[PDB]
Structure 1
Amino acid sequence: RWSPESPLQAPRVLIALLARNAAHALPTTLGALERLRHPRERTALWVATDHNMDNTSTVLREWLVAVKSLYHSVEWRPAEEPRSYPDEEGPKHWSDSRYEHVMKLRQAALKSARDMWADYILFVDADNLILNPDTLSLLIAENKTVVAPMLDSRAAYSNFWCGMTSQGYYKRTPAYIPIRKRDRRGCFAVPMVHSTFLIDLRKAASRNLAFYPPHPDYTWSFDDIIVFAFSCKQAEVQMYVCNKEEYGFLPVPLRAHSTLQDEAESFMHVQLEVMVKHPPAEPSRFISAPTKTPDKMGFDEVFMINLRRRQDRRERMLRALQAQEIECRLVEAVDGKAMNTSQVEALGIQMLPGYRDPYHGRPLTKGELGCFLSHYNIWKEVVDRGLQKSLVFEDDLRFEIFFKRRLMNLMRDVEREGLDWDLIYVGRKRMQVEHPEKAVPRVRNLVEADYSYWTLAYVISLQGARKLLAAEPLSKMLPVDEFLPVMFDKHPVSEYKAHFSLRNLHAFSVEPLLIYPTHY
Structure 2
Amino acid sequence: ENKNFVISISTAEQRRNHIIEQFTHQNIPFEFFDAFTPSDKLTDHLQRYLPNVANAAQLTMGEKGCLMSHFMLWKKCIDENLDYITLFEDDILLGENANKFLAEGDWLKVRFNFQEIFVLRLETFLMPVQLEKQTQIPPFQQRDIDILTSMDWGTAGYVISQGAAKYLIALFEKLTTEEIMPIDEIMFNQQINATDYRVYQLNPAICVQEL
Q: TM-score range by the shorter chain?
A: 0.7 to 0.9
Asked if 1:310 is matched to 2:5, the reply is no
1-structure distance, mates of 2:102, 2:90: 18
Superposition pairs of residues 337-486 of structure 1, within 5 angstroms: 337-339=38-40, 343=44, 344-351=46-53, 363-405=58-100, 412=107, 415-418=109-112, 420-430=116-126, 453-471=153-171, 472=173, 475-476=176-177, 477-486=180-189
How big is the shift at 1:480? 1.3
2:196 maps to what in 1? 504
| Matching residue within 485, 488, 494 for 2:191 | 488
1:120-157: CA deviation from partner (whole Å, max 9, x where unpaired): xxxxxxxxxxxxxxxxxxxxxxxxxxxxxxxxxxxxxx
How big is the shift at 1:489? 2.9
How big is the shift at 1:367? 1.2
How big is the shift at 1:329? 2.0
Structure 1, gaps ≥5 residues long: 1-295, 356-361, 433-450, 491-501
Q: 1:485 to 1:503 in 2, by over 3 A?
A: farther
Q: 1:512 to 1:352 in 2, by over 3 A?
A: farther
How big is the shift at 1:330? 1.6
Superposition pairs of residues 37-52 of structure 1, within 5 angstroms: none
Aligned-partner SS, 1:424:
strand
How big is the shift at 1:374? 0.2
2-structure distance, mates of 1:428, 1:415: 23
1:201-238: CA deviation from partner (whole Å, max 9, x where unpaired): xxxxxxxxxxxxxxxxxxxxxxxxxxxxxxxxxxxxxx
How big is the shift at 1:504? 3.0
Superposition pairs of residues 89-128 of structure 1, within 5 angstroms: none
AA in 1 matched with 2:19: M
2-structure distance, mates of 1:410, 1:388: 10
1:160-186: CA deviation from partner (whole Å, max 9, x where unpaired): xxxxxxxxxxxxxxxxxxxxxxxxxxx
2-structure distance, mates of 1:352, 1:422: 27
Aligned-partner SS, 1:392:
strand
TM-score when normalising by structure 2: 0.72
How big is the shift at 1:429? 3.9
How big is the shift at 1:473? 5.3
1:152 maps to what in 2? none
Aligned-partner SS, 1:454:
coil
1:399-442: CA deviation from partner (whole Å, max 9, x where unpaired): 11111125678962x5444474510000144369xxxxxxxxxx
2-structure distance, mates of 1:374, 1:320: 22
AA in 1 matched with 2:15: R
2-structure distance, mates of 1:367, 1:454: 16
How big is the shift at 1:463? 0.6
Q: Is the 8 A contact 1:430 1:452 kept in 2?
A: no
Aligned-partner SS, 1:427:
coil
How big is the shift at 1:475? 4.5
1:514 maps to what in 2? 206
1:321 maps to what in 2? 23
TM-score when normalising by structure 1: 0.32
1-structure distance, mates of 2:12, 2:205: 25
2-structure distance, mates of 1:421, 1:346: 26
2-structure distance, mates of 1:305, 1:342: 18
Q: Is the 8 A contact 1:349 1:474 kept in 2?
A: no
1-structure distance, mates of 2:157, 2:84: 13
1-structure distance, mates of 2:28, 2:15: 16
Superposition pairs of residues 240-251 of structure 1, within 5 angstroms: none
Q: 1:341 to 1:468 in 2, by over 3 A?
A: closer
2-structure distance, mates of 1:403, 1:342: 36
1:499 maps to what in 2? none
2-structure distance, mates of 1:364, 1:459: 25
AA in 2 matched with 1:481: D
Q: Is the 8 A contact 1:489 1:504 kept in 2?
A: no
Q: 1:309 to 1:452 in 2, by over 3 A?
A: closer
2-structure distance, mates of 1:376, 1:339: 18
Q: Is the 8 A contact 1:422 1:463 kept in 2?
A: yes
